[PDB]
Amino acid sequence: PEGLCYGLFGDLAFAAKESLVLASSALSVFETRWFVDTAERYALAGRPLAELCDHNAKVARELGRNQVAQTWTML
């Protein structure tokens, strides 16, 4: 009597029998990001190695990822 799906840039889709929550069912979609913003702010070519590393380190720090930031700096 059930159906589930997890499609993402977002949340779930649940369909369950109405005697569990008979010959009817109830369908509801729930409402439960850092990937898109870091993919168009990076830089992979066109500068020497030192200039590339510090640029990427600035993006990660602003987004809120500190561990990733220090990996760029050590490199």
Partner: protein, 302 residues
């Protein structure tokens, strides 16, 4: 956290819900022998775009195909058939019908994109068949390639979504028979290039209660495999290849009974890090694993 609500206007139970590749469309099938397609607007509400009769018996499952081939959907029914539909320019038309079956068809799934356009169906008589479309721009011509006998009933199948060149194609099959004797209910098949035939690779002798759903996990760079099983409880397994059929070291890393009832459906997320489970109580539960490989719950949704 929040919960929307949409009126399906179906005349019987909804048996399946599926999202698409880009996350904006949605399909729903029921026992009133119909298939509906939903779209999302900028306002955020969902509207029904199409609705048409498909089979003469109950429809169990509906699934999408990769957008490289078109807008394609597949369905299976109690009519012992399976169909392929395509959207053309704004209604849907039937392209083929697969009628080789002899009992009810219980599941249908599309193969990962790097194998081509492939389909796999399972039947209540214990036969799993695999079809193929050699030329993409003619969707009315399929071709039967393989056939597997499982010596038991069948209820669910799943592919291995790994895209590596070191992993051969896989498929896993689950049973639902409730005979008093205790036999294995999950079997895994593998494809050998030299002989060009699927062969049995491993069996899960630890699973004896009936199975209701089975799902692999997205790989995204891992070196081993993860499997999720729906039974009286929730079990999660690991298969690590070793250095004929390939040998695996099978372990179990979760067994959760927080539903206190039968578990019906399972589903993973895009990155393969969170698992969602649905049970007879009417609640959805989410599981996640920390860096010490201990799986713990993360939310309850009702």
């Amino acid at each position: 956290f929040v919960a929307r609500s949409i009126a399906a206007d179906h005349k019987d139970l909804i048996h399946d819900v599926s999202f698409d590749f880009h996350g904006r469309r949605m399909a729903t099938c029921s026992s009133d022998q119909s298939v509906k397609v939903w779209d999302k607007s900028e306002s955020g509400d969902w509207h029904c775009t199409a609705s048409w009769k498909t089979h003469s018996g109950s429809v169990w499952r509906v699934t999408w195909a990769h957008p490289e081939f078109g807008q394609v959907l597949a369905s299976c029914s109690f009519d012992r058939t399976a169909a392929v539909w395509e959207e053309i320019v704004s209604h849907w038309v039937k392209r083929t019908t697969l009628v080789d079956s002899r009992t009810s068809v219980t599941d249908v799934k599309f193969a990962p994109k790097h194998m081509g356009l492939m389909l796999a169906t399972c039947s209540a008589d214990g036969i799993v068949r695999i079809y193929e479309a050699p030329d993409v721009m003619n969707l009315s011509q399929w071709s039967l390639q393989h056939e597997i006998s499982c010596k038991l009933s069948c209820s669910c199948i799943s592919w291995n979504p790994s895209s590596s060149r070191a992993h051969s194609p896989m498929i896993a099959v689950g049973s639902d028979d409730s005979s008093p004797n205790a036999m294995a209910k999950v079997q895994i098949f593998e494809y050998n290039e030299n002989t060009r035939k699927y062969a049995k690779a491993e069996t899960l002798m630890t699973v004896t209660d009936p199975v209701h759903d089975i799902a692999f996990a997205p790989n995204l760079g891992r070196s081993f495999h993860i499997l999720a099983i729906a039974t009286k409880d929730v079990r999660i397994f690991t298969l690590k290849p070793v250095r004929g059929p390939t040998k695996f070291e099978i372990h179990i890393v979760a067994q959760f009974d927080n539903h206190n009832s039968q578990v019906w459906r399972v589903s993973w997320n895009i990155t393969g890090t969170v698992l969602a489970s649905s049970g007879d109580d009417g609640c959805v539960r989410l599981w996640k694993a920390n860096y010490m490989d201990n799986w713990k719950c993360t939310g309850i949704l009702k």
